[PDB]
Amino acid sequence: ATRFASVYAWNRKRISNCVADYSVLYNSASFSTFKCYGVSPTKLNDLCFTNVYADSFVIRGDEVRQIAPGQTGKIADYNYKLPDDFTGCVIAWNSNNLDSKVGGNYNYLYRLFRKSNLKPFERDISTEIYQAGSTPCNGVEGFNCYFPLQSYGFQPTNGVGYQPYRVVVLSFELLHAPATVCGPKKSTNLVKNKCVNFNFNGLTGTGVLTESNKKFLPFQQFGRDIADTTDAVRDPQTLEILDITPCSFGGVSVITPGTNTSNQVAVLYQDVNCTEVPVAIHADQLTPTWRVYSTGSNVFQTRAGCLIGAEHVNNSYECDIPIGAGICASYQT
């Protein structure tokens, strides 16, 4: 903000009617302090707290020490008493740019005394002068007319602790709205025809995204089948619909003759294309044996699945080992 309100006049500005991307906003990364006591937008990038407000105010450097929960004293008592249990973080950085000095702009005063400390959530914007214990005063140079608003160290300052910090508290005191406005907008690229874990607007699922010809309605976002299982998802970043299917999901059967006769065996992968069989078992096992059965010259495809280690033959014989779909395997040459 070009102009920052004083601590005594901190504004409870709220943010809504849009979706934000904290990652882009964090390009500067000039914040001096990071005190987070919850699911912060920086710490957590998959939530959209609704009742989130960015308090636009400026405080002196030392006051940064008193921006903790349940804090009391000076700023925490009279100027800005944050909620005792506030969900959010406190951000403070030393700029001293708008003030035109390294000491502190005089306009950034801070209320004090008044014998009335703030509540954890209330504000007492008022220009009234502190009342004396013998005769009321409201200005001039009467009896104990001390101005509650005291200017910062406009004179030269040595330590940063006595300088104006553009401190904004990202406290979100959600009451009835779980999440409507997003601070962080973490996102990745798009992958198709590959088994991956996808998170679309909080819907998490493992599958192979593929281009879909379904024509979802403009308001419609997700899709489902008669079984009440997701089978199509719309890209939130573009008017595109992608299907969802299990990655491979097969079973392994060992077509083996009697060990008293031979030891070589065949492997059947249920209802999976042979092209995916090498990746089906990851081919990460011990180099011989399994790898030989992972793929090879003798690979056959059938309604049952992919058979490796058996040589397809035109000749038809009696069913020796039942594989399925009217197809059987035998050890005979």
Partner: nanobody
Amino acid sequence: EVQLVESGGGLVQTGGSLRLSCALSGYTFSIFPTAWFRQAPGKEREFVAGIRWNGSTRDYTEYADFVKGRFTISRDNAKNMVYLQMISLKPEDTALYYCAASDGVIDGTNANAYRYWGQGTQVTVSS
């Protein structure tokens, strides 16, 4: 640490005049008010005089009724020091004088609220 040093006082004939100096260091004396108190044998500590810097145009001075119209108090922020001028002194004025300052702005008559107190100096008035 905040240090307050009092100088002046001594023995003076009744009806004379005196000047007490209080030098304060270790804090911002310009804005926080400074109060002069006197403690006499058998008497507690009560407000005697005070000076405050409202910050707008002038320094306000408060004087106790029993010494009103005779005691003057002034503050020099550049020198961070306080003058207390007394005229037409009386025998009852014999006492130990302290000068006190506060870490913040407080009521002038609130002696206890003054978190800083100096050693002080003895003043005696003889007929």
